[PDB]
């Protein structure tokens, strides 16, 4: 059935854009991961690399 999606429709009938992002963890190495270190570089200091 139809939408219409008029600006004169109610709040229950206005067009809303929805992304339902989903994930699955198979027996494969992970691919969608955030930036791991991504901070900065130093040198010649007693530091934990």
């Amino acid at each position: 059935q139809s939408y219409g999606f008029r600006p004169t429709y109610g709040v229950g009938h206005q067009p809303y854009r929805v992304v339902v992002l989903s994930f699955e963890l198979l027996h494969a190495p992970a691919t969608v991961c955030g930036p791991k270190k991504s901070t900065n570089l130093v040198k010649n200091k007693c530091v934990n690399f």
């Binding site: 198979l26 494969a28 190495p29």
Partner: protein, 48 residues
């Protein structure tokens, strides 16, 4: 899967080359598949 590759220059023109050659991994796909029988295909012309 991790393909090891080499593209060597040879001038001896027989069988297997007699030398020291080493291959390198360049493309890895950790994807997951059982392998039993393989093959390979060649590009040619059926006279078009």
């Amino acid at each position: 899967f991790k393909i090891y590759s080499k593209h060597t220059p040879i001038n001896l023109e027989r069988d297997l080359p007699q030398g020291f050659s080493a291959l390198e991994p360049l493309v890895d796909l950790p994807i997951g598949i059982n392998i039993t029988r393989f093959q390979t295909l060649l590009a040619l012309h059926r006279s078009y």
